[PDB]
Amino acid sequence: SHMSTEVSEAQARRAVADIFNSTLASSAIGAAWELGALDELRENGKLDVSDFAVRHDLHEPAVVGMFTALASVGIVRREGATVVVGPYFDEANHHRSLFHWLNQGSGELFRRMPQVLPNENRTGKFYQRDAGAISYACREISERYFDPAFWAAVDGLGYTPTTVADLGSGSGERLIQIARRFPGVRGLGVDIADGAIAMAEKEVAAKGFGDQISFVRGDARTIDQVSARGEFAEVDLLTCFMMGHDFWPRENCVQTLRKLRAAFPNVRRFLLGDATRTVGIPDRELPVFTLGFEFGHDMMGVYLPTLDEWDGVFEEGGWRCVKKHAIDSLSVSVVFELE
Amino acid sequence: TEVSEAQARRAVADIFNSTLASSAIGAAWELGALDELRENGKLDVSDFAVRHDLHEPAVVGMFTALASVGIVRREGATVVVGPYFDEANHHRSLFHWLNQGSGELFRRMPQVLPNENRTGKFYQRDAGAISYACREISERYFDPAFWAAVDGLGYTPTTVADLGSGSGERLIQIARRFPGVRGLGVDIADGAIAMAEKEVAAKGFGDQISFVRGDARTIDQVSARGEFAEVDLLTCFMMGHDFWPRENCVQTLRKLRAAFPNVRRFLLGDATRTVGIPDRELPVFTLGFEFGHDMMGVYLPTLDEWDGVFEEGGWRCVKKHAIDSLSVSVVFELE
Ligand SMILES: O=C(O)C(=O)Cc1ccccc1
Ligand SMILES: O=C(O)C(=O)Cc1ccccc1
Ligand SMILES: O=C(O)C(=O)Cc1ccccc1
Ligand SMILES: O=C(O)[C@H](O)Cc1ccccc1
Ligand SMILES: O=C(O)[C@H](O)Cc1ccccc1
Ligand SMILES: [Ca+2]
Ligand SMILES: [Ca+2]
Ligand SMILES: [Ca+2]
Ligand SMILES: [Ca+2]
Ligand SMILES: [Fe+3]
Ligand SMILES: [Fe+3]
């Protein structure tokens, strides 16, 4: 029953108030996550705010503030010095990486909406986001949302892989997990980020797989320029998650897919997964994330293909699509099994 | 806490979209959108992006963000005011303050809460943005009570000083109302002074109104003491909370008393900390003001705390005005 055009002054006051407080609740969700509060609430159902502030060595008045902000829209409920989980807790906590993405990750971009929209201002470094924050969030996003379909696609391969290349390798947590599934397999991540390489080289070393897995600086759109080219010949599983839209526009993508094909000519399966642009979802029925993903990419000047556009580009790219998975609850997100 | 899993999905999605709405309101304001919607009730997003020279797809996003929570309604490339437009638009400066002025603060909630980090410049805000909003906040929420206090002063001022003079607009208006008056602005920010002086000069009040850098907390250090002695009306809006904690406010009030010994009336308007409002009935702003200041480590007195400090501070409160509708806000007439 949402969609009315006619409301009382009471309702309108209340609604504009909730929009205001949601703003704070929404920033608080990502913050509370990162400070270990959501976890503890998930684990114990309850928490004493004073004891929290002490244990974690936090300024207590703001801690009160963070919880009151979560309480203002029903994520938690306050009783005395106690915070309990609220009716909206599980849902919010579930999607906690998405709010973090929105606020801590991408907060600056959306804050400067009045400066980002005007054309004259659109060149060089016309926006900023917190790459450490994004990273921190995209890690849980990849796990909470993409893993099931990722693992499902891995199950239905028809072969044990021997050498896997992961594009947008990042933390290396995709490749690390591969090694753990397929004992003897070798890994190879590719990342534009200098910092992601060392974070990954460190990550790998720490988890047992030092001589199994290595990384390289490089960019899918010019993967043929990359000096490790010669070793791509032995790769028989390729993977690429949450960056496919940055291959776009279409012709870039076609080319990028063709290059990928030639550069990895013994790849049997290529697992590609990403969120896509939605179409025709009504303004007042938008689910979590959708609006921020699409809006932020518009504000960054970055094109987002629809599912159909992905469908329409693979044959041209030199790939056959043999299986597709829908992601649960992250806009219209998908995993394609290509060969 | 008994709701369906669909209830919870929808509520959580509203919080998320609300975030983007909220930021959008101040954006829309600043870019002319809200005003063009108030005047005509409609707008064409292509037309509007073109005239304003904006990247259209971001413009659409911005208007979708607003429609996602009922502020506006989209019908093609036509944007129409929605059920919550009047109210949103009314409080637009407050959303601006939260987002454009103070977004960097609340964003870094994880880095700002831990005590170890809390030294030096531990948070950042956008002084230009904040100033932009404070202008309207002053005018939409404080002015009615402000002018009512001016109307019942029982004297006609001859020299007025305004602490946190900002853009100079308070002193300007005072001059438009009392032509003979001299005006004196105290602001701690060089850039407030520069703006105000420029603004005062352009409008022709450059010979009546002038400015000095100073912190009202240390008003006794501001070496323009002779001009201060001539002042018979003192104004201070939206910063009294910054005189607290209590001991500090007592001292500041006593120094203000001394620095302006011929002030007859002293107008002090501020928002104050609320008490016992239920979490799910917090009105607009309250949570922002209070939570933001707890994050900045700045004390907020209650009303009663203010009422109980003036005598020790060297003043007698003779009149008090309630404000609509800015958390619990107030104007004291002190003497
Ligand atoms: O931040 C970005 O640029 C993204 O595109 C983030 C993203 C992509 C896919 C799923 C979730 C987030
Ligand atoms: O010095 C002057 O310019 C004035 O006459 C003062 C003034 C100018 C313009 C409007 C009101 C007062
Ligand atoms: O921004 C601050 O730190 C303020 O104190 C802002 C303010 C004070 C009183 C009313 C509205 C905003
Ligand atoms: O067009 C599609 O739907 C996807 O590109 C993948 C796919 C195609 C055919 C059968 C299954 C999956
Ligand atoms: O105590 C109060 O309510 C205010 O400090 C000011 C006031 C006092 C007495 C009569 C009127 C106003
Ligand atoms: Ca309804
Ligand atoms: Ca029109
Ligand atoms: Ca800032
Ligand atoms: Ca009282
Ligand atoms: Fe992206
Ligand atoms: Fe303040």
Side-chain angles (χ1 to χ4, degrees), chain B residues 14-25:
Chain B
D14 293 338
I15 296 161
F16 188 104
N17 295 325
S18 285
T19 310
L20 294 162
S22 173
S23 182
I25 283 166

Side-chain angles (χ1 to χ4, degrees), chain A residues 17-329:
Chain A
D18 294 328
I19 287 155
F20 193 93
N21 300 329
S22 290
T23 314
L24 292 161
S26 173
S27 178
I29 292 162
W33 176 28
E34 167 168 358
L35 301 159
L38 290 185
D39 288 325
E40 177 170 348
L41 286 154
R42 178 179 53 81
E43 293 171 22
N44 302 320
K46 263 180 204 284
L47 147 177
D48 171 83
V49 312
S50 267
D51 190 84
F52 195 85
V54 167
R55 271 189 275 117
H56 290 273
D57 191 40
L58 306 180
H59 175 56
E60 191 173 335
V63 162
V64 174
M66 182 183 65
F67 291 116
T68 308
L70 299 169
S72 60
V73 290
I75 287 178
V76 312
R77 213 157 33 70
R78 290 191 309 144
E79 270 167 321
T82 289
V83 177
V84 311
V85 304
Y88 307 145
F89 186 81
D90 292 324
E91 187 64 10
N93 173 58
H94 186 80
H95 287 305
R96 72 195 180 182
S97 57
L98 303 191
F99 290 92
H100 191 281
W101 182 83
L102 176 73
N103 295 283
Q104 285 70 42
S106 314
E108 238 316 86
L109 158 74
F110 292 114
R111 188 182 76 70
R112 305 201 322 107
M113 185 179 312
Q115 287 88 34
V116 163
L117 264 59
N119 294 132
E120 57 208 303
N121 306 329
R122 299 195 133 247
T123 32
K125 204 182 177 169
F126 69 85
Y127 65 79
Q128 190 51 319
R129 311 145 93 200
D130 176 331
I134 280 162
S135 166
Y136 182 95
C138 275
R139 191 181 180 114
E140 172 157 305
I141 288 160
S142 181
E143 206 182 294
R144 186 150 307 180
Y145 301 93
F146 288 93
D147 268 19
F150 172 66
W151 292 119
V154 161
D155 295 343
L157 281 168
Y159 68 104
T160 315
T162 53
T163 304
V164 48
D166 180 34
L167 306 164
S169 51
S171 62
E173 186 63 22
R174 200 166 313 288
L175 297 167
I176 283 153
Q177 293 309 312
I178 299 300
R180 283 193 190 161
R181 158 74 95 97
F182 296 126
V185 77
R186 294 209 67 199
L188 182 77
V190 177
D191 218 308
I192 191 179
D194 302 85
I197 293 283
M199 208 264 180
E201 267 160 18
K202 281 166 165 136
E203 198 75 59
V204 162
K207 281 152 165 199
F209 307 104
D211 25 45
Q212 298 211 247
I213 298 157
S214 22
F215 304 85
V216 307
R217 262 255 299 145
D219 215 272
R221 289 86 70 194
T222 52
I223 197 62
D224 52 359
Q225 288 176 32
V226 168
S227 58
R229 232 289 206 193
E231 304 169 10
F232 297 161
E234 286 202 334
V235 174
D236 58 350
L237 167 57
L238 188 65
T239 59
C240 177
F241 275 61
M242 299 164 290
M243 70 156 308
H245 60 274
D246 290 320
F247 296 170
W248 281 62
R250 195 159 188 287
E251 305 82 8
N252 252 243
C253 183
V254 166
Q255 306 265 315
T256 306
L257 292 168
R258 288 181 189 169
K259 285 189 189 153
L260 281 171
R261 212 348 150 187
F264 296 94
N266 281 120
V267 149
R268 288 176 74 186
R269 285 280 163 76
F270 172 22
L271 315 189
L272 180 66
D274 209 5
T276 62
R277 171 164 244 124
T278 59
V279 189
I281 299 181
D283 286 350
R284 290 287 271 123
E285 295 184 353
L286 288 154
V288 75
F289 195 54
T290 297
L291 176 58
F293 184 60
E294 289 172 26
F295 187 19
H297 281 96
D298 282 334
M299 292 184 72
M300 293 180 267
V302 181
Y303 189 77
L304 281 170
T306 66
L307 184 58
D308 275 341
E309 290 178 288
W310 271 116
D311 287 358
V313 83
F314 293 121
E315 183 183 281
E316 270 194 71
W319 294 93
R320 185 199 180 199
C321 183
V322 306
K323 204 157 179 275
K324 188 156 74 172
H325 310 250
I327 303 294
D328 218 281
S329 302

Side-chain angles (χ1 to χ4, degrees), chain B residues 128-251:
Chain B
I130 279 171
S131 146
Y132 184 86
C134 277
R135 187 194 176 73
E136 175 151 306
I137 292 173
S138 174
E139 172 171 343
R140 191 155 302 177
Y141 307 90
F142 290 92
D143 260 27
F146 177 64
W147 297 111
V150 167
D151 302 333
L153 277 189
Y155 67 106
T156 274
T158 75
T159 292
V160 46
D162 180 35
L163 311 174
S165 35
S167 68
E169 185 64 27
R170 193 170 313 278
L171 291 164
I172 282 155
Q173 293 292 308
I174 290 286
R176 306 213 205 255
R177 172 81 143 70
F178 300 115
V181 76
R182 295 275 163 287
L184 175 52
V186 185
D187 206 292
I188 196 181
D190 286 277
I193 311 288
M195 204 202 152
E197 272 168 357
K198 175 190 127 200
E199 213 66 37
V200 144
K203 302 182 175 160
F205 298 98
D207 49 328
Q208 280 175 255
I209 313 188
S210 77
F211 296 88
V212 287
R213 266 222 333 96
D215 184 338
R217 293 166 319 184
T218 58
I219 189 67
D220 57 343
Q221 292 178 45
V222 172
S223 84
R225 296 266 209 183
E227 328 196 58
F228 283 3
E230 317 207 80
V231 176
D232 59 352
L233 173 60
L234 185 71
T235 68
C236 179
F237 277 77
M238 296 169 337
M239 55 170 290
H241 62 273
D242 298 311
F243 300 158
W244 290 66
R246 186 170 203 276
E247 166 66 80
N248 294 263
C249 180
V250 181
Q251 295 167 337

Side-chain angles (χ1 to χ4, degrees), chain B residues 14-59:
Chain B
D14 293 338
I15 296 161
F16 188 104
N17 295 325
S18 285
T19 310
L20 294 162
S22 173
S23 182
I25 283 166
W29 178 34
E30 183 170 330
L31 302 156
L34 294 192
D35 286 320
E36 189 180 337
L37 288 160
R38 187 180 30 73
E39 287 163 317
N40 317 332
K42 320 162 143 291
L43 138 173
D44 178 276
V45 307
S46 306
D47 200 78
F48 174 92
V50 170
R51 284 176 282 110
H52 293 270
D53 187 50
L54 315 180
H55 186 52
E56 190 145 351
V59 173

